[PDB]
Amino acid sequence: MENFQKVEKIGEGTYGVVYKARNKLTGEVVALKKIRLDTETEGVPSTAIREISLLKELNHPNIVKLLDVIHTENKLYLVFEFLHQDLKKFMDASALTGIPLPLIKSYLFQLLQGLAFCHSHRVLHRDLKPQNLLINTEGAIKLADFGLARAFGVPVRTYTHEVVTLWYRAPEILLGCKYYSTAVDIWSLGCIFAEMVTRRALFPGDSEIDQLFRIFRTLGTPDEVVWPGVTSMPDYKPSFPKWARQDFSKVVPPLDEDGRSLLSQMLHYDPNKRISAKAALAHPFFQDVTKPVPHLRL
Amino acid sequence: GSPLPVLSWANREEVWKIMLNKEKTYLRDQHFLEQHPLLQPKMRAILLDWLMEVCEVYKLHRETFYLAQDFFDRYMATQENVVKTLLQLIGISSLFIAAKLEEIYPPKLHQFAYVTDGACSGDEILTMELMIMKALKWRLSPLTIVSWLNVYMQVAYLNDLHEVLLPQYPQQIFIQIAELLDLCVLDVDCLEFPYGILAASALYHFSSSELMQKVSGYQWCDIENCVKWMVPFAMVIRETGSSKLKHFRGVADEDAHNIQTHRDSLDLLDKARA
Numbered sequence: 001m002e003n004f005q006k007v008e009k010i011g012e013g014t015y016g017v018v019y020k021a022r023n024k025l026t027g028e029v030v031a032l033k034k035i036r037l038d039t040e041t042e043g044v045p046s047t048a049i050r051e052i053s054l055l056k057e058l059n060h061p062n063i064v065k066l067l068d069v070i071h072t073e074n075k076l077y078l079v080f081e082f083l084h085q086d087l088k089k090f091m092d093a094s095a096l097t098g099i100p101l102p103l104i105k106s107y108l109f110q111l112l113q114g115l116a117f118c119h120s121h122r123v124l125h126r127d128l129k130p131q132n133l134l135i136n137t138e139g140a141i142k143l144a145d146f147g148l149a150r151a152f153g154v155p156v157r158t159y160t161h162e163v164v165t166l167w168y169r170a171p172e173i174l175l176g177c178k179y180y181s182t183a184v185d186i187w188s189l190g191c192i193f194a195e196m197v198t199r200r201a202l203f204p205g206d207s208e209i210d211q212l213f214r215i216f217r218t219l220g221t222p223d224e225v226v227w228p229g230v231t232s233m234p235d236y237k238p239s240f241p242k243w244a245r246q247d248f249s250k251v252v253p254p255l256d257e258d259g260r261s262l263l264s265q266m267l268h269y270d271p272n273k274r275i276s277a278k279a280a281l282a283h284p285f286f287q288d289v290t291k292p293v294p295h296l297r298l
Numbered sequence: 299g300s301p302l303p304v305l306s307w308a309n310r311e312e313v314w315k316i317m318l319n320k321e322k323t324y325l326r327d328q329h330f331l332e333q334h335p336l337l338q339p340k341m342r343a344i345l346l347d348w349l350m351e352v353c354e355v356y357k358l359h360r361e362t363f364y365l366a367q368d369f370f371d372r373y374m375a376t377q378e379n380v381v382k383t384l385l386q387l388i389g390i391s392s393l394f395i396a397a398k399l400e401e402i403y404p405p406k407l408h409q410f411a412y413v414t415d416g417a418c419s420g421d422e423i424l425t426m427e428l429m430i431m432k433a434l435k436w437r438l439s440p441l442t443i444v445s446w447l448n449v450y451m452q453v454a455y456l457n458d459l460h461e462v463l464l465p466q467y468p469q470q471i472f473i474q475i476a477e478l479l480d481l482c483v484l485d486v487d488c489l490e491f492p493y494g495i496l497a498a499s500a501l502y503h504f505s506s507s508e509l510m511q512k513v514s515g516y517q518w519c520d521i522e523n524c525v526k527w528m529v530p531f532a533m534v535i536r537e538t539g540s541s542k543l544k545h546f547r548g549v550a551d552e553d554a555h556n557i558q559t560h561r562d563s564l565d566l567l568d569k570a571r572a
């Protein structure tokens with residue numbers, strides 16, 4: 001840890017203490033996550049062991065790379081690739097002028113690619129929020145903060161309850177589903193998609209029941225037809241008010257009919273029917289950004 | 299071949315190839331104890347059997363034990379010359395790393411030092427867990443022997459509506475096949491065969507080659523060497539009978555099969571050597 005010189009503190013949160021460092025010989029800048037082991041009674045935190053092992057096998061252009069893990073003096077340094085800005089600060093800076101639609105389409109496309117890579121490797125992110133989406137000066141956006149991530153088995157079992165930040169939490173989590181998998185990340189990305197379009201959080205709830213009612217107020221109170229088994233979920237109440245689904249022309253006005261279709265499929269109540277990351281890449285919303293590969297029908 | 303059905307969330311072939319490709323990332327040597335001339339293969343069985351009993355006391359998952367087994371075998375392949383008294387520290391620390399990775403509410407550090415009867419302190423475990431993770435290049439996400447059995451059981455009981463992520467298979471027959479695998483893992487010569495081969499070979503002894511091939515994708519010629527090696531271990535289980543599905547207080551019955559159990563065994567591993 002000699003060639004690195006701290007430049008500025010990026011922030012301290014649930015992730016830990018992140019500094020912006022600069023290599024003196026090469027000029028490289030990195031993001032340095034500092035973990036004080038003398039403070040941790042249980043040794044290396046479980047979130048750190050998970051994140052390190054998952055990221056050493058998730059090498060993808062749309063995932064923030066883990067470069068090195070250095071254990072020096074009762075401290076654990078995690079060297080990450082550096083990106084200069086998170087998506088939340090970019091959307092706020094763009095709130096008056098609006099993010100250009102080609103850039104929204106490009107960002108969502110890249111996010112779906114990095115997410116499809118995570119899911120094909122059987123990894124749930126479980127904390128997709130604009131603060132965890134990092135962009136550089138070359139038009140790229142990348143998934144970051146895999147501390148809340150978990151690799152799921154085939155089949156899955158009952159995992160940690162009440163995951164994902166509240167505003168981006170899927171309705172099946174709010175209703176207390178036993179099992180969950182890749183659909184929770186697609187919901188979060190659908191919320192982020194609409195947030196880039198409207199420059200405002202789609203469901204800015206303050207409690208679990210208020211988050212659920214905000215979802216019901218926009219997408220309609222779900223029933224057994226649109227979501228088989230919803231009435232049997234532990235947190236479902238028959239006393240839930242009945243709201244009608246709002247026309248997506250009012251939810252996302254600037255979005256065209258291809259965008260509204262993709263957003264609807266990412267916000268489907270039924271997690272089994274909710275569009276997958278790979279299928280979303282094939283949606284006609286990106287037909288101008290990508291061309292399909294020939295499929296071997298064997 | 300690939301036994302997975304059409305997956306809505308990714309290419310069924312891609313998910314399977316990724317699971318297969320990482321098996322080449324994680325190397326195993328069935329003769330890593332030749333790097334430690336002071337150790338004998340029986341000591342490894344005594345340690346792994348002890349970790350099994352530790353898992354059942356704290357109701358740890360089967361995945362947690364097999365993670366500790368894989369961390370133990372791969373860490374030893376990187377080291378040279380180890381004494382007997384150091385085996386307990388490496389084993390309990392591998393289980394400490396595994397429990398923090400898999401369990402939602404894992405046991406605390408002092409409890410891992412508590413089961414060692416004072417032979418391992420809390421600071422010794424924290425020193426050992428860092429040496430293990432650093433020597434393994436932080437490659438702590440392998441496909442365990444028991445994880446393959448979970449895949450094979452879901453595909454065996456796949457309905458016409460292909461949904462492979464929601465679990466659905468008899469718990470009674472799952473723990474019976476796991477019982478055979480828990481015995482075979484005590485013998486160090488199992489590392490000759492890949493983890494996916496060992497699980498498919500144990501499934502074959504409780505079913506058939508047709509069922510094995512439909513859910514594992516491996517031809518009979520791939521597992522014949524493993525099946526013939528697993529021959530003695532399979533009959534010792536058949537001679538004593540199949541075990542019953544236990545109920546663990548505080549654990550839901552839909553997850554009761556995933557809890558690691560412990561039988562005396564050991565003597566069963568010796569009957570297979572004959």
Ligand SMILES: CC1(NC(=O)O[C@@H]2CC[C@H](c3cc(NC(=O)Cc4ccc(S(C)(=O)=O)cc4)n[nH]3)C2)CC1
Pocket residue numbers: 008009010011015018020031032033064080081082083084085086131132133134144145146
């Ligand atoms: C920090 C957070 N959690 C997290 O776990 O991320 C991991 C660990 C470190 C890695 C990183 C972060 C970054 N960049 C940024 O986060 C954004 C940023 C850049 C510079 C400054 S400044 C003017 O110097 O104060 C302020 C803010 N690149 N790589 C990825 C939310 C993303």
